[PDB]
Amino acid sequence: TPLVHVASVEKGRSYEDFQKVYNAIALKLREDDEYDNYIGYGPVLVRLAWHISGTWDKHDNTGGSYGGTYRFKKEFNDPSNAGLQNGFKFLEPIHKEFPWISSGDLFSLGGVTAVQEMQGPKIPWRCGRVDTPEDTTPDNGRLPDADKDAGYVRTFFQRLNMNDREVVALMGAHALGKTHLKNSGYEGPFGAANNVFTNEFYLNLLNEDWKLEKNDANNEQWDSKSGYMMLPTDYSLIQDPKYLSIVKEYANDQDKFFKDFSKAFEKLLENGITFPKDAPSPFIFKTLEEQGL
Ligand code: HEM
């Protein structure tokens, strides 16, 4: 019925092996700091880990991070994936240095690394994704649109098994990076510290004086006087009563947010995967800084 995707550890690799993949990504983040006006690749890597996992469909178990399908042209050229080719090119040299790691493992680990190196919470990670054939490649149109409301959001997230708390936690990733007119038809940074992971998203949502305006792509976006932007979908988080109390909580307790994000991020990344009982426990990578590197 529903595919079964069983996690299979890359033959003979242990934690120390993954730790080295992480340090390599981390060191390259540190070094290629000029990308996107000095934002770095942090933000784009997180978005890549989310896009490759976001095609999951809890109904027939297709999509999700398992198969590393993003590697195939059909998924690669998904209009909703515009701009991700940048994170991809960043990871190639790494892949070339550690060719035994599957695609799905590499892509998702990049997401984890970026978060943790951007001072976010530690995200437990599990290895075992296995590259699947080009034909397991999900059709385009599974990633969400930005021009909708709270109802759309709720509904969408339901396909990935996420509840309200999880949706709002995960959305605080929008404190990172920015929108790029040529990629999405939206333009502008989401906040001020755009490569440091904090509860900024929530605070901005509550505290700014937002103006609905149309952009040069002729789409509507919420614009703040401080020069930030919010998508309709971000904004809807304060339109929905259920969502808004969660926003409030997060605005109030970065710690709770960090706890919730961590869980929800991991869940997103592990959707559709079966972990045999003998599978190693989730790894918790040290940062460069914890290693004194
Ligand atoms: C309704 C759900 C979502 C929608 C509609 C959405 C849409 C977008 C759009 C349109 C962009 C701008 C891309 C560009 O023009 O370069 C963006 C950026 C971004 N998204 Fe989301 N997103 C959603 C949820 C998420 C989630 C769940 C995460 C991670 C948990 C995430 C992480 C990011 C990051 C970090 C960026 C900034 C990327 C950069 O600076 O290149 N987003 N998102």
Side-chain angles (χ1 to χ4, degrees), residues 2-10 12-33 35-72 74-88 90-95 97-181 183-224 226-258 260-276 278-293:
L3 298 286
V4 194
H5 305 291
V6 180
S8 191
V9 178
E10 289 89 339
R13 304 292 171 182
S14 62
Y15 161 73
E16 314 85 64
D17 298 285
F18 291 100
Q19 177 75 245
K20 290 164 192 196
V21 176
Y22 171 112
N23 288 170
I25 298 163
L27 283 171
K28 185 169 175 36
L29 278 164
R30 185 185 290 164
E31 149 179 274
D32 289 16
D33 75 350
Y35 172 79
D36 224 359
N37 283 296
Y38 294 94
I39 287 167
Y41 283 87
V44 80
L45 299 178
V46 171
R47 183 181 163 232
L48 170 64
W50 130 258
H51 269 228
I52 66 89
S53 293
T55 59
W56 188 64
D57 179 346
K58 75 169 163 199
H59 310 281
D60 55 12
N61 212 5
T62 52
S65 60
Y66 189 82
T69 56
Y70 169 77
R71 81 185 179 279
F72 301 113
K74 172 169 87 179
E75 175 166 352
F76 190 79
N77 289 318
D78 186 352
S80 325
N81 284 344
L84 287 183
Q85 45 282 277
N86 284 345
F88 185 73
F90 171 103
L91 296 164
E92 286 169 6
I94 307 256
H95 208 164
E97 188 167 338
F98 305 91
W100 50 262
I101 193 166
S102 69
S103 291
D105 276 359
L106 181 61
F107 298 143
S108 61
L109 176 59
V112 178
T113 307
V115 168
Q116 300 191 177
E117 296 295 305
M118 282 192 292
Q119 296 168 254
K122 300 295 198 105
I123 329 277
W125 178 83
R126 298 174 95 142
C127 59
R129 305 172 185 69
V130 176
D131 286 28
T132 59
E134 195 164 9
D135 81 322
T136 56
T137 313
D139 281 304
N140 301 348
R142 297 211 195 195
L143 289 172
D145 306 313
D147 65 349
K148 316 294 217 227
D149 72 331
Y152 173 82
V153 174
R154 188 161 276 111
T155 274
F156 175 86
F157 273 103
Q158 256 306 279
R159 197 197 65 208
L160 303 170
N161 227 52
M162 295 298 163
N163 69 8
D164 291 353
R165 176 158 301 263
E166 295 170 332
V167 163
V168 180
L170 274 185
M171 214 77 61
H174 276 170
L176 319 160
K178 65 191 296 286
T179 65
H180 306 82
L181 199 74
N183 290 349
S184 57
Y186 294 88
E187 188 44 61
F190 296 112
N194 41 159
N195 65 6
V196 188
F197 200 90
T198 76
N199 69 168
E200 198 184 338
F201 172 82
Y202 307 106
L203 291 166
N204 283 359
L205 261 184
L206 306 180
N207 302 148
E208 296 281 309
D209 182 33
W210 305 100
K211 309 293 173 230
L212 180 65
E213 322 194 79
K214 252 155 112 79
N215 61 33
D216 313 318
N218 199 54
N219 296 312
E220 294 194 321
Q221 46 183 264
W222 292 93
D223 290 337
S224 127
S226 303
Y228 320 138
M229 67 74 82
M230 294 288 166
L231 305 164
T233 47
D234 300 314
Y235 202 68
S236 90
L237 297 192
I238 59 195
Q239 301 178 313
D240 187 270
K242 290 136 278 160
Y243 283 152
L244 168 54
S245 19
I246 311 169
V247 174
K248 292 186 150 163
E249 201 181 336
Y250 292 148
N252 279 275
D253 188 2
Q254 155 152 256
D255 198 50
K256 182 44 183 183
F257 158 57
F258 275 21
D260 288 4
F261 184 89
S262 174
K263 268 153 202 127
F265 199 49
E266 185 172 7
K267 172 167 169 189
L268 168 73
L269 289 193
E270 296 173 357
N271 281 338
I273 312 170
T274 299
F275 296 105
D278 76 305
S281 257
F283 303 128
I284 290 138
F285 305 119
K286 318 243 113 300
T287 58
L288 283 197
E289 162 165 67
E290 301 177 299
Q291 294 169 272
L293 283 45

